Structure 1
């Protein structure tokens, strides 16, 4: 079970759990568990659990874009967003 990309996004982001959860709610496809399910299942890092579930359900690409969009609104440097997107 290789969660390298999920772990990388978990480390890279500077967003709050509130904002990460809001992104998850928006981008979640129906075959992925709802946010409340994720939160309940989470032992330890919540953003790691969310990003693992996005990886498992093939939407981490979209979740990474959402996270990068909210980081852009908080003036995260463009090249740092592009570095994250390349990796994740």
Structure 2
């Protein structure tokens, strides 16, 4: 779905990316950031690999946004942050095709 694509497109660090997720989850029963962080940290250590924990965290956050219906709002917010980091418009175009 667009959750895996968005998680695939973003370059934001989790420390920054966590803010939009926390911001866009208002009004939903979605997991908080510490709940996500605790859940993902355990899931990472139950199947250890070379996959960075940051990638698993970001993918879990995008999936949770999709389950509880604020993935579109989260995609807009992530693109906003990337544009603040001067992410090239050519790369923003790749994710803009979801819209």
TM-score (normalised: structure 1)? 0.85
Higher relative contact order structure (alpha carbons within 8 Å, sequence separation ≥ 6): 2
- Asked whether the 8 Å contact 1:64–1:85 carries over to 2, the reply is no
Q: SS of the residue aligned with 2:79? A: helix
Q: Which residue of 2 aligns with 1:70?
A: 81
Runs of at least 4 residues off by over 4 Å: none
Q: SS of the residue aligned with 1:9? A: helix
Q: What does residue range 24-35 of structure 1 map to in structure 2 within 5 Å? A: 24-31=21-28, 32-35=30-33
Q: What does residue range 9-88 of structure 1 map to in structure 2 within 5 Å? A: 9-31=6-28, 32-42=30-40, 43-44=43-44, 45-87=56-98
- Asked whether the 8 Å contact 1:27–1:63 carries over to 2, the reply is yes
TM-score (normalised: structure 2)? 0.76
Deviations 1:15-74 (A, max 9, x none): 101111011111112222211111122134000000000000010101111110010011
Specify every segment of 5 or more residues in structure 2 that has no aligned partner in the other structure, as ranges.
45-55
> Between Structure 1 and Structure 2, whose CA radius of gyration is higher?
2
**Aligned residues, how many?**
85
Specify every segment of 5 or more residues in structure 1 that has no aligned partner in the other structure, as ranges.
none
- The root-mean-square deviation of aligned C-alpha atoms, in Å, is 1.5
